[model samples]
Target chain A: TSILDIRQGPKEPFRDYVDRFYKTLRAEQASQEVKNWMTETLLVQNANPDCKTILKALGPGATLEEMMTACQ
Target chain B: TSILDIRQGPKEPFRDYVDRFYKTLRAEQASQEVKNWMTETLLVQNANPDCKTILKALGPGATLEEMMTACQ
Candidate 1:
């Protein structure tokens, strides 16, 4: 499946969904920038606004591992 | 534009199209494997049947640069 086809379930734990997402992403042939773009955009888009506030506070430099930990 | 959005034009030189494709690909964050997958799939899918024979003769281990030079 395409990475764009993935979505976070409403009841799914953020960490769980992210784990699945990361795996799916790895199967794709993309550069680090594209990977990060998908990671940030998809995660933030699926998050609650309050959760987004939390992520944004991590600043733009936040790593995916860090973001996953922070959200969890 | 997304890499999937790119296509070789009817009159475009194969080398020229490949160059454009590579540049667009580099702008995204993808792994080496993913990058190669995109390179092989897109390039092979767009080539003429005879051209496909040329690529196939290169064997599966052929690198993108090798394929590009071979086709040109």
Candidate 2:
């Protein structure tokens, strides 16, 4: 099985959001749902601009397949 | 009196010499005279191009007063 290492965007606009994410991680306060959502959506999306737009359109519940399609 | 903190040059030409100097320091095998000469000459001279030239001209027995004269 392949394990994916995901990271959130370091965009200027998302500085506070990223800071909160790190704080939650440090405090062990984030839910699995939040982790999945952030890792699958925001993190993967930021890898390309087109994928970012697709993520925005699909909203928070965007699936990994849909995210991959956005990259193509 | 102000304390002088001198650093050797990170010049590409002197990389091996600097490595040897550090190795000697780590081994604690350097004499007081070797330390003083190195600290006074290589470290200080490397600060500026003119000082480097002066040290080369003065050779091994270069005095502190002579070094000070070179800076002027």
Candidate 3:
């Protein structure tokens, strides 16, 4: 997975981050999985939680692993 | 949200899924929220967590709800 430093100011940095993020996602070739996950996990769940806060709670390197772990 | 069945074996099916996904995302206008969540959650989180698997665990029709729940 590619790393992005959002701390950098300027729209270019954000745009680059988005480009890299999309490229990595495309290279991973896991769109179906991502869609399913988004629908199954993100959509069904409540929306009160801020996305960033939720991520912090999930902890570092909190990949789709949390979803699997939730399944168990 | 649009529903996509990957059972169809055509590249178009996948592309359609992507199109719908993007459309839904754009319509929702939650890119900033999603981006923040990705950076804070997915990037920092572990890799063992397969994105698809996580979605399954999150259950069907999952929304950003889970993220909110996690914060609590």
Candidate 4:
């Protein structure tokens, strides 16, 4: 298992989350589908506990732009 | 915003998630504290939706081995 599969303390923010999610990651698949899922995973995991701050913005679904907005 | 910040497509598994979380991550802090937190981040994110699949197994609190067990 990789590092993030362990923990990410409260001090970290979304920007930091983004940095690590990519820096420490490795994938054999280059498909867009794999890419998008990874994106949602970090934001959701790194965001506030309920993720309401981001989830509310996502609503029934989230666009790439909207996902970025939610993280911001 | 990074790739996983957008989505990780359902097809990807926790193993892939683990690898990516480490590769794409970048934390300047030099401490075990940060390391542990990031570890939790990926496991929670990459686990089954609702994370209840793992949470239920976690009970009141969970051990690392238990976490590994749940993911398995």
Candidate 5:
């Protein structure tokens, strides 16, 4: 129920990890601003190096879905 | 440029925290879904206990603006 509970594990696919993370964020009932910040923090931090590269290229202000789509 | 840069400090006012957080999210240019999700996650998690209670009462699917308004 905590945002701290989920992370993108090394073995987990990016898409799958995001799906679970999204669910966890929802389950925790966070506000939109917090959700976005946490999304950027967790997703970027835990992303595989390749995915992280793509994310960085996408730059700031890119949404999670946008990042995920780009990563895929 | 990183979302990790900002957090609601203990001495910070909720309104101040949220204002800065919203700016950070926008600066990061996260997608709406991610924005919404992150908004909820960070705000609720970092919210003061009193605010947290109110946020919980606001229930799921509540937007950041909605939560802020209710909190105020």
Candidate 6:
């Protein structure tokens, strides 16, 4: 079963939602391409917008951990 | 974007990988429910099946932090 199969909660805070996404990825054992893909997707749906900017700046190589720090 | 999208490195150690997930989660600010859900999900994917054994013993309400402890 996919944790990503989950629907995003409307009220879940941006940071919280992203965190959930991160955990599920490791559990499922996803890929760098997938991470890159989601990095773009999250920015489009992003709440803070500020986080998106930081992540975008980091471009392709940043770890999931680094991106989450920007959300802070 | 789903962080869960990233493909797991084939050689990543289970605890190191899980620790990365846990750290990313805190940095993202996940919710209690998401936290619980991922906790269960990870145990199922567990590299040290022993960890999953303990988690099953703990049931579904466990936290990522708690599961990581079991990995150790």
Candidate with top TM-score is 5
Candidate 5 stretches greater than 4 Å from native: B5-72
Ranking by TM-score: 5, 1, 4, 6, 2, 3
The best-first sequence of candidates by DockQ reads 5, 4, 6, 1, 3, 2
After superposition, candidate 4 runs with Cα above 4 Å error: A1-8, A27-32, A50-53, A60-65, B1-72
**A1-72 per-residue lDDT for model 2 (tens digits):** 001112344443344434544455446444554455334433543344544565566555555556545544
User: Fraction of native Cα contacts kept in each candidate?
Assistant: 0.00, 0.00, 0.00, 0.17, 0.25, 0.17
Estimate, for each residue in A1-72, the C-alpha lDDT of model 3 and write its tens digit. 222222212322333333444454467463554534443333223122343345334543444446334322
CAPRI-wise, candidate 3 is incorrect
lDDT of 5 at B49: 74
Which is the winner by lDDT between candidate 2 and candidate 4? 4
* Worst 10 contiguous positions by lDDT, candidate 1 chain B: B37-46
Q: Which one wins on DockQ?
A: 5
The residue-by-residue lDDT of candidate 3 on B27-61, one tens digit each, is 64645645344323332231123443453345433
lDDT of 3: 0.36
Residue B23 error for model 4, in Å? 30
After TM-score superposition, what is the CA distance of residue A55 in candidate 4 from its true location, in Å?
3.3
Relative to the true structure, how large is the alpha-carbon lDDT of every model?
A: 0.63, 0.44, 0.36, 0.48, 0.69, 0.54
Q: Tell me the TM-score of chain B in each candidate.
A: 0.65, 0.43, 0.31, 0.50, 0.68, 0.49
- On residues B1-72, what C-alpha lDDT tens digit does candidate 6 reach at each position? 243443234565556767666676677666554445455554344344555466566655666567657655
Residue A45 CA error for candidate 1 (Å)? 27
| Candidate 5: residue A23 lDDT (0-100) | 81
| Runs of candidate 2 exceeding 4 Å displacement | A1-72, B1-31, B39-41
Q: Candidate 6, DockQ to 2 decimals?
A: 0.08
A1-72: candidate 1 lDDT, tens digit per residue: 244335666677678777776777677645565566555455554455556668767765577778878777
Flag regions of model 3 displaced more than 4 Å.
Answer: A1-72, B1-12, B32-72
Instruction: Write candidate 4's Cα lDDT for B40-69 as tens digits.
Output: 444455455644356444653365556655
Q: Candidate 5 — what's its lDDT?
A: 0.69
Candidate 1 residue-wise lDDT, B1-72, digit = tens: 255445667667678778777777678655665566555455554455655568767765577778877777
Residues A1-72, model 5: lDDT tens digits: 355456666666789978877787677676676565666666675577788778878876788779889877
